[PDB]
Amino acid sequence: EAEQAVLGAVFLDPAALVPASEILIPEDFYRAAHQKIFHAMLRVADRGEPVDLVTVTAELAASEQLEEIGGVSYLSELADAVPTAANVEYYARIVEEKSVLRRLIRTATSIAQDGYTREDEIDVLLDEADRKIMEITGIPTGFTELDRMTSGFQRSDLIIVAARPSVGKTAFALNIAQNVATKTNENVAIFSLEMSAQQLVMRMLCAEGNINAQNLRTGKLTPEDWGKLTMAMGSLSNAGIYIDDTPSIRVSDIRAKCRRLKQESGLGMIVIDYLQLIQEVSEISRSLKALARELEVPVIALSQLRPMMSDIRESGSIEQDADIVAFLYEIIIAKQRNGPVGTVQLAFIKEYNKFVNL
Amino acid sequence: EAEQAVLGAVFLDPAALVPASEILIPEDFYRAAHQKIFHAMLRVADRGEPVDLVTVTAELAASEQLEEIGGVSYLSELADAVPTAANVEYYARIVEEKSVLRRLIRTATSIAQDGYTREDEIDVLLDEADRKIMEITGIPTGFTELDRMTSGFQRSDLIIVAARPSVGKTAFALNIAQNVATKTNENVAIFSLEMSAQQLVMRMLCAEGNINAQNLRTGKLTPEDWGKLTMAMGSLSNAGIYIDDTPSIRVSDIRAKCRRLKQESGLGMIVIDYLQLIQEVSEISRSLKALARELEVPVIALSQLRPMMSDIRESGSIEQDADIVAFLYEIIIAKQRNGPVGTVQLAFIKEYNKFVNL
Amino acid sequence: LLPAFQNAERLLLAHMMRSRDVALVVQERIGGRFNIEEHRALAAYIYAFYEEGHEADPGALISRIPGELQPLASELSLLLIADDVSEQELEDYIRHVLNRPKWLMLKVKEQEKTEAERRKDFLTAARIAKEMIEMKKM
């Protein structure tokens, strides 16, 4: 009935079409007949010309669905029936609602129906089941003058740190995660898709007790090294670091694991190791932003590519989803919504694998 | 039905006859009865005297086809039927089209029919086959001498400004948008499909307080820049600018948002950033003209291509929908309907990103 | 599918029945003055109702209301409405009702056009028709 109101009110105002079309597409209509009309209605509006009884009946005739609806009789029925066009929008919202409900049902019924025919998948089934159904502040960084431009890292922002291979993007994100763990009291979650979980640990053990030329890797240590690891181990032994080196994981699983950790222990940072390596990327970017929003936590997504904006942009959106885009080169905060944009300069040790102040 | 509308509309306006007869001659009508009326309608207009129900029912009677149509009954029927005569032309175009189709069929059928009876010719058959088949007002611009040639920018005109990449077509539109907002008291709506919303604002912050080599971009400013932006910000603060940077939008959405803004606040100009980038273009051109007409507001569409007419013509209509076509090179007003056609020269600063008088 | 004015007559009841703040606006503007006998009888009942200082809900109205009005008054209280009638909605509805005797009119001169046409008085009927186009524009 509300369907007939919209159609009707268009024949009446017919500036009514504008709000109607801002809220409906032909597909929202349940009856094909109306679909046809509303489409013709729009197709006449795309000139043009304007939209009224004779001009629509004429587009319908043209594409030959005039008699496939009502006649002109049903168009007139609609026209003569409607008493006002101050609703429409409406009416529109009603039809739009009942449309959403049909889609809900359809995509939900498609899941049950799909439940028996796969079996087989469980994981594809459970993912294309979310996919189908979906359709200083702050936290201190450790580093004095990165804090200032940003004031955190704050909760619900997606931070993307990009840098060419072997500039130090991992070693940078790890130190952030480490400082946040050892110095605050806030659990950090690391996904290290590339490197193993234990080859990650010494890379932050080295980062602390200022250990290693001697080296941890190459067997034996001096008394100074030993007496060092012991506190480095000790200090990092109480930190709130969680690691997950699961080979290469899909978004929904980062999201599921992070979700469970928030309720049981705390959570403050999600540091994902590199995006390009998670498993189009624009559709992942989107999901990472939502993750941050849902968990009121800053998500640091590392990325792979001078540098500047169009280096990453050309490969999957990101730009409009991430609210702060860092570059390692110099730390170039090229985009942030907190405020300032510029270059912060950090020293880098190597031997110890630390990024340090200045 | 389209036929009835034309005739009906005449009994209504009846200045509806002028465009009707520009587009139709009696024979374009399929029904004879309508042929008779439209002809009579035209025979009366050929004095005289003017054309209304009475006078037409008189002419029809006089050449004795009054009962050979409907009666006055059918004349009243047309009259009393049609609600509006702001179409007609139309309507006219609809009837004219279906007239052309009939002619095609007739001359094509006559070719087939002629295919058997000759045989004989081949060459008269094939030749007479091509032969047969071929048959100041206004809204001030800010810029003294642009105003004179145009007197506005006025309400219901679609103004298209075209210029090769990096000649200043955006900067030019912006400065118009700016002078209108800061100097009059009339809201302007900018769609900036290409450049971001905030990248745009500096480009018109700079184009005021005469700011920038120092630069706003490259961090720090002088006590001369600071004390400058503050006024520039202050003066632009109260202006009536509305920006929409939505990536790339369809016309129905430009038309929808601008319609809302009219009823709630005001509206004087729509400045669309470039047309070739909105989302065949002849179907968009048409729409922009109809947007300007509906909102009684000048729509400035920027376009991408020496220059001259055929430089944009070859890429989708525009020529006959735009009633004023400006080129940036020199501002070449190559077509306008108000009056004059010719070159107005404008200075351009660059550092401040301003177009200035001369 | 029902003519406009009737739907506005209908909906108007559907609103005043539910909102007795609307009924008070309808009362000064439309008699009724309502165009259909049923709608007239109901409006008389509605108007009264509240003049009995009476709170406001159809559960009460539909229980009032001779019984021959009930099958209709029932199916109006279930109609379909937002509760809240837009400022113009009301002026659009009332306009239809109020200027319905005016359409019921021009069919009186309509019968005069055709009666003139039959006695071959062609220019008179023309005038009548030109007259109708005027009233019709209103």
Curated annotation (Swiss-Prot), chains A, B:
Q: Does the keyword DNA-binding apply?
A: yes
Q: What class of enzyme is it?
A: isomerase
Please give the residue ranges the record annotates as the region C-terminal domain (CTD): 136-358
Q: Name one GO cellular component term.
A: primosome complex
An MF annotation (GO) of this entry:
identical protein binding
The record's catalysed reaction(s) read: Couples ATP hydrolysis with the unwinding of duplex DNA at the replication fork by translocating in the 5'-3' direction. This creates two antiparallel DNA single strands (ssDNA). The leading ssDNA polymer is the template for DNA polymerase III holoenzyme which synthesizes a continuous strand; ATP + H2O = ADP + phosphate + H(+)
Which EC number(s) does UniProt give?
Answer: 5.6.2.3
Positions bound to ssDNA: 313-314, 316
Keywords from the UniProt entry: ATP-binding, DNA replication, DNA-binding, Helicase, Hydrolase, Isomerase, Nucleotide-binding, Primosome
SUPFAM superfamilies under this entry? N-terminal domain of DnaB helicase, P-loop containing nucleoside triphosphate hydrolases
Upon changing residue 169 to A, the result is: Loss of helicase activity, reduced ATPase activity, still forms homohexamers, ATPase not activated by DnaG primase, still interacts with DnaG, almost complete loss of ssDNA-binding
**Stretches assigned to coiled coil:** none
BP terms from Gene Ontology: DNA replication, synthesis of primer
Q: So what does this one do?
A: The main replicative DNA helicase, it participates in initiation and elongation during chromosome replication. Travels ahead of the DNA replisome, separating double-stranded (ds)DNA into templates for DNA synthesis. Binding of single-stranded (ss)DNA to the hexamer suggests a 2-nucleotide step size for the helicase and a hand-over-hand mechanism of DNA unwinding. Has ssDNA-stimulated ATPase activity. DnaG primase stimulates the helicase activity (the helicase direction was not determine but is probably 5'-3').
The entry assigns this protein to a family as follows: Belongs to the helicase family. DnaB subfamily.
**Annotated domain remarks:** Within the hexamer the N-terminal domains (NTD) form a rigid ring, while the C-terminal domains (CTD) form a looser ring; the 2 rings stack to form a double-layered ring. In a complex without DNA or bound nucleotides the central channel varies from 25-50 Angstroms in diameter. The NTD interacts with the helicase-binding domain of DnaG primase. In complex with ssDNA and an NTP analog forms a double-layered, right-handed spiral staircase with a small internal diameter; 5 of the 6 subunits bind NTP. Closely contacts 11 nucleotides of ssDNA, the 5'-end points toward the NTD staircase.
Which named protein is this? Replicative DNA helicase DnaB
What gene, per UniProt, encodes this protein?
dnaB
From Swiss-Prot, chain C:
Query: Which superkingdom is the protein from?
Result: Bacteria
UniProt subunit comment: Monomer. Interacts with replicative helicase DnaB, as DnaB(6):DnaG(3). A stable complex DnaI(6):DnaB(6):DnaG(3) fragment can be isolated; DnaI and DnaG do not contact each other (DnaI in this complex is derived from B.subtilis).
- Job description of the protein: RNA polymerase that catalyzes the synthesis of short RNA molecules used as primers for DNA polymerase during DNA replication.
What family does this chain come from, according to its entry?
Belongs to the DnaG primase family.
Q: What is known of its domains?
A: Contains an N-terminal zinc-binding domain, a central core domain that contains the primase activity, and a C-terminal DnaB-binding domain.
Name this polypeptide is given: DNA primase
Q: Look up and give the organism this protein is from.
A: Geobacillus stearothermophilus (Bacillus stearothermophilus)
- Recite the lineage of the species: Bacteria, Bacillati, Bacillota, Bacilli, Bacillales
Q: Which gene encodes it?
A: dnaG
Question: Complete protein: which residues are present?
Answer: 456 to 593 of 597
